Symmetry: D6
Subunit: 169 residues, 12 copies
């Protein structure tokens, strides 16, 4: 009989901040402000503790820390947010990014009462794209040369989904 | 056996946190640092008052006095028991204690509470304690995907003090 | 005659102060102007309340308060106050319609509610007409001028507004 | 003819000052800068409340609510009329007004006052308003070279509201 | 057995917190320790109150509060509290004598006074003995545990102390 | 002989703040923070004076104040920004929004050295859309129900252009 | 019939500070801290507004500003203070220093409830000394070379009086 | 052969503050501000660290802490200060107060370059008085009821000495 | 006729502003409030020093000493004349003045300047003042759509003082 | 052996302090650690400089400084320093390549430049090899250990990097 | 004509600013008024320097600076500056006498000293006359307008003043 | 054997203190808390610079550069050796080191020192290092009961660099 893992969103605590930092060279941001060194992240963190426009969860698999969900650009008048998920290397390969997306959908849609959620992914990532489609995300744009990455401008696909689709299922 | 009702101390916050969206002085929290910070910001704020419910010296739940007003002499209260302490009607004794505090110590005139309409047990309990119903608040909360109704119930100091 | 809402500027704060005995700003009490100026400065970016001067032909005629605004549960309480001299011209009615408009068509709330004196059978009727539901009768909710009074809480929903 | 009772505004301070040792929030003042400063320090302090007494729109005196407590539901009041307005029993109407405010607006249970024993007029006035005597405080004040006695008198909300 | 007053140190503040339901510091209310620590830090140089641990053979046994201290009128109110386990050994009596000593022979006050429950006929008697005068009976001065209680205010003067 | 107007971008001064405020009910934002009352705007303004992620110009026509250009979400690693233009009512009807766009293109492209600029407009605004095309903006997405406006979710068209296109002309 | 002047102590207001400053070269002090320039005095003044250990009155003669009384080193446990009076040049010669002393005695003794007041004066000032005696001040010390003044150490006479003497009269 | 103790003034460090506090009921002061609880003393201490108008030494006897010298009311224009010495109970009886006075004389006179030092003592203390005389202190005043002490006003004797007397010896 | 070189005062800022992207203490500005603020932030900063160029008492341009270093004893200078004052070789006299200040007052050893390669006039002027060329900085600035080259030129205190 | 850049953490600040006599942080001088700790705290979010520890097999081996970073003109100066004991293993070469990589493939700069002692003919040659151009010779730019020295400024461009 | 010292008020600070190229306040350099206003505000209670306007018939004529004031060693340096238009009327002489008076008869210093250009043989002579001693010749102490200059340090003592 | 000259670090303060009236940035200290505080107040102050003198890695003395000025390019220096390290002419090597730093690193033109007239050894040492005498400062210090004379001596960068 196959054993069932338990995957949970958990509100991101300060003690989680080291875990965040060491998920990894590229630009990372906190509240649209960029960081590199731990001291930069930690100070941003305290400056933004009460800020309602981003919310972050750790993904626990069986209580162990496996990755991070960031809801970002939260807007409560237009009832949307963007999300971003990131799975620690030793937790990849086993459907986590998927479950993890379902859980963030659940959070924005059933807890936070947003109307629309979207995400950006590399145009190159035919894998992820197709998964999101599977879950019934529409494609709403192909941003051209939106990111300059490892020496080169890359294209992003923005894909959205809606509260009613979600609750209908 | 023994249930006291101790003021909420800063060491109690990690306990509090370890019990859907939560409010401290009407400002929302999720992280423990969010609530901790919020806590010190509202240290001398008289508009809310909190107590750990102690069973035989162990921390077993929480009473909140919220929206305390001394001109109109009223306040709201929420009571929360930890799972492992539920279903011995601490929820009940805690309610009496809250009532004792607000009516005999704080000298309030009126105490009210909100509860999900569906919670027929609580509604019954409080009616037993002689609370009367004053409202059915339609779709007052978005809870886990859905709007829910609450029932608000009150009781008055003269009713209590009949004791 | 024409009637508009307008965000409340510090310059309006003197006007607000003297509509006449007990009142609040961002839930803290106030009486003197200095008390009020101070709260106002403190709550400049507080999202949980939003105010408006009610303008009647470019003239300050009253005030709309949007209070206890919650965006997760998409609701908010409102209250209107009309300077003595603009009363009895159905102005608080037009102001109500306008506050609904704002919370429903701009703030994107789901539910708006208010509390009035049970005794005010008149206002009560005006709301019922507008399609508001009674959602409760609070007993002795307010000590006012020497006695406890009852109030009625009445609510209306976005979809009812966007329909009719 | 007309007597209102307006909240004390900052413009009123120069008036206040222009009326032996004075107290603001139990801290003493003499200079106007001493009182002014003190004033802002106690802006959101609910423990005292002040009003100018207005006769036909002119500033004519002062009511102070001091030591306001909402659990025991009581407060003290001092009333001060400016000379040119004395002896028309504004002192009286002012007292009623204070009483009106504390009992019908602020929802206090009990109001008391201190007055020099020797002030037989005030003592009589208040007894007329139905205040009862609760103490003769021996040498409670050093005033102009000498200890003086005060009389403390109270009245209760139920007594007033009989109206 | 020997009994002393001792100025109250921050280290005593944990002791003070748990003598058991409503209390004050420099006239502001408190309940939680964090609330109390804070007031204490704020009032460090406040001249208007002075506190002391009552030490019984080098052991913390209670507390003396000197409150509403006025130096122009040379008076001050006092209150004593004895930990449950040191009561009924005439300790609050020795503590009273000691507080008088301090206000009279050190602070140079002219008058000291206190307030007790009218119902506490015992304490009342102890003070009368010490030469205290009743200077008033306050009616329903305190809402306590469900009802308004009466209190008695009793005073004594320096010259009476320095004589007897 | 037809008289030539002079249209200029001018760096936005504090004294311009009243003009901004009174360009008008809808949500307006300053540095992604929302305002309504003048005191809210003015305080945001001082809080963000040195912030490199938004830049604002007044459009002077013949030295008189005619409208406002906001470059927003400026990113210097991905070399882009979003722009927004707004023409005062008495200056509409006479090609200003157009010239005004050309000028902001010039600023980002020739002064600020961005690589890409884009804009959002109402899907409904077939007029503006076609103009931007005329100037050789590509369409890069149709965001669905992105804004809730006057009681109703509306659709936006994001359209971009690039430094090389611009300098080529 | 000779006309009676009215001489009053008045609590020192900030607007009085210029008058103080220009009562005049020597060391002057405010709360035991020294001043020379107006800005020094004014800043000391604000730093010490609530300080209970010095109190200052202006002497009004017929409502016009004639001089200054400083009660200094106020101690409420030992119930004493030192006083110092200073009469503006155009108000000297007409008994003011005297009345002015009586008034400060009245203030400390009948208002402030001190038990003892004293003063220092130049040993050289046989005039003032004898006046204070007249008013029944005892001599309680002759401080030797206590002040270095205009190139030279000078001797001071400290003289005291008591509440009971005063009220007895 | 009798063994010689070494008695030294040492600048008072913060760690000395507990020792000070526990030299003992009466009013004690720090920079003319009164203290009782340790937290009061310690906060005064930090508020006054750089203040030139009081200086304090510990008296070490053989390196062990035996008492305290306070130079107080230091005035560098009139070149004087008052001093106060206090010997811990277990170090009394063995000439310390004496040596300790000589050392403070040495400090003010030979290090600090004051011209005059004085002290107050109880009129009742015929012992100390006579010692100071022995060292050639003049008596310069008998302050009457200057201190209210243990229920009663007491009289003080102020006694001074001068740099030239001292260096002459 | 007369050219002084006055220290830059706060009243001069509106003038400064009224003269592509500008820098104050290596931080960029455009609005006047941006530069004003920046100005006070760098009031006691010794690393840059500024002067208005005064012709017969009127404000006519600007000298900036920038990147001032006292161990290596060097600094950079920019000079800016207002249009209506250009082409009388104030640019020249201003340069001499800068040179006078840095070499005879500030005791610098070396002064250098950057100028667009294309500005053949400036390059010539300075070579005339005996500045020598020390670099051709390739595409050192993006200016109005294009990378541009600058030429850096220096001169030394001993060379100047030969005077 | 493997070599990486890594953002510089406060924990690295002690390491940085002791590579041996005159140096800067965000253009302000420093000597003592306390001086340095302070500048570092002040410049935490300063975009104009970016630093990195050079790691050799997970071991701290040196430092890369990106200085005078300008994003409008898309350039920045760089400098590398290798702890005494890691020198002469072509490590500063690998570190240079890595700094180019970062400014060119991550920061998206157009131009990177450096300044070396004219006398250092060795380093100079290493850069020329890498495709760097000499863009100037600064005369007596640095007073160092008793005399003014000359320096060379050499630059390279993104397109040259992204090509070869 | 009559000549007085007068403590320097903020109102004098504009006057001070324009006597014409390098100068200090409480040892920090300044040039612009804003720079100076700031130092002045910072040093309001600094005991180590004391300034005075030199008044000639109630008119501002120059300035006296008392600098490096040390009370333990009882000395202080002084400097005088006279507005162009009041020079050559022996005014700096009367101002010197007055500064001596102040430090000697008011501040109770033991020693006062000054530094002048060796080349200024005139001033030098005026001081010698006043009884000042040369206590040193500092070599190349000042870089001024293009070259290092020598200065002379001359001192006088209280007892010499209080005698003659 | 080995003498380095390390910058003064905060851990070195307790050492410093453990070496009559002392000055930090011309402000006086005695307690260690007085000097410690003063220390942080002057952390970025360029007007003074300090170094521990290290003999074979142990702390053995102190060089102070004081009154550093970069326009006139001069500074003063005091050197202090701890007793147990005296009389091996570390005082000498330390002096050379100071000289090395100010002249070859800091690019000063001139260095001077003050020493009690009576210290004939120091005076001789420095004259040997080729310092010349520029003043005999009469009663410049009150030291242990008496005014004392100091001798000031300087040397110049060109003289040193002759090396
Ligand atoms: Mg954004
Ligand atoms: Mg004193």
């Amino acid at each position: 009989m196959p054993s069932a893992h338990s995957v949970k969103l958990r509100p991101l605590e300060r003690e989680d901040l080291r875990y965040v930092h060491q998920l990894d060279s590229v630009m990372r941001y906190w509240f649209e402000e960029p960081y590199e060194a731990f001291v930069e992240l930690s100070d941003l963190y305290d400056k933004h503790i009460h800020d309602q426009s981003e919310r972050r969860f750790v993904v626990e698999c069986d209580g162990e820390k496996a990755g991070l969900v960031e809801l970002v650009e939260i807007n409560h008048v237009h009832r949307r947010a963007e999300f971003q998920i990131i799975i620690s290397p030793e937790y990849q390969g086993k459907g986590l990014a998927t479950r993890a997306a379902k859980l963030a959908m659940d959070y924005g849609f059933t807890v936070l009462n947003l109307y629309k959620l979207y995400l950006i992914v590399d145009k190159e990532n035919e894998k992820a794209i197709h998964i999101y489609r599977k879950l019934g995300f529409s494609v709403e744009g192909e941003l051209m040369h939106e990111f300059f990455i490892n020496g080169q401008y890359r294209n992003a696909i923005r894909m959205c989904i809606f509260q009613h689709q979600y609750l209908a299922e």
